[PDB]
Design a protein around this nucleic acid. Structure first.
Ligand SMILES: O=c1cc[nH]c(=O)[nH]1
Length: 223
DNA sequence: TGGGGGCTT
DNA sequence: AAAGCCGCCC
């Protein structure tokens, strides 16, 4: 059907008519008529197409999409075949390997598996100019993504959130630490993986917390 | 073989 | 806000 999944549109609809958003889309479109922008128009909101807002249990949040051609497709750190898993997804794979013994490198970079399971693969800023990192930062995405988190926070229980990287962690000060389990760590990029990511064991810690709260855990190899 | 965050000034 | 300094696997 369309760009936004039913539940998501329904619950984020209140944002559409807000000036910050109007102008924002205005900005992005302009951008497009003058520069290559990722992810392409139809893919900016893939994260809403993967599962109903009502049954999202975990929220992995990154900063901006891959400013490289063929990478950014709507789900954070994910690349659709026949594109290979970029550094960030390789580092994520290294951890998963050690963290979850049942897990083995799946041979591709599509994260739709987790997504369909109830993992919101969000990103703070949803679009980026070709070959130019941080270009669409502070244009309105943050407030929109703030809106996403905000809602999820107010209307859910036991959401396990994974805030990877400083910019991502900024959102943490809007999550009720009592009802929701929050885990932080360095962004998986080569440039920042050694500062904590490697060894965090978020994935396992996640199934733990989720099982504890009486909810089916995640099958991290099912992707 | 160099392009892929985190913190300071 | 912009720019510099630093950091690092197979
Ligand atoms: O989608 C992606 C890729 C890299 N870094 C992020 O924060 N998100």
């Amino acid at each position: 059907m369309e760009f936004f999944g039913e539940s998501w549109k329904k619950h984020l609809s209140g944002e559409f008519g807000k000036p910050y958003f109007i102008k924002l889309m205005g900005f992005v479109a302009e951008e497009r008529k003058h520069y290559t922008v990722y992810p392409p128009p139809h893919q900016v909101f893939t994260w809403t197409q993967m599962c109903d807002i009502k049954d999202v249990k975990v929220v992995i949040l990154g900063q901006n999409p891959y400013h490289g051609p063929n990478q950014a497709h709507g789900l954070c750190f994910s690349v659709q075949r026949p594109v290979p898993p970029p550094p960030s997804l390789e580092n994520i794979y290294k951890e998963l390997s050690t963290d979850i013994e049942d897990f083995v490198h799946p041979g591709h970079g599509d994260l739709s598996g987790w997504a369909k399971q109830g993992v919101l693969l969000l990103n703070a800023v949803l679009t980026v100019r070709a070959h130019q990192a941080n270009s669409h930062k502070e244009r309105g995405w943050e407030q929109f993504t703030d809106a996403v988190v905000s809602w999820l926070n107010q209307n859910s229980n036991g959401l396990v959130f994974l805030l990877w990287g400083s910019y991502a962690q900024k959102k943490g000060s809007a999550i009720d630490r009592k009802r929701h389990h929050v885990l932080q760590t360095a962004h998986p990029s080569p440039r920042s993986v050694y500062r904590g990511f490697f060894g965090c064991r978020h994935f396992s810690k996640t199934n733990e917390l989720l099982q504890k709260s009486g909810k089916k855990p995640i099958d991290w190899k099912e992707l």
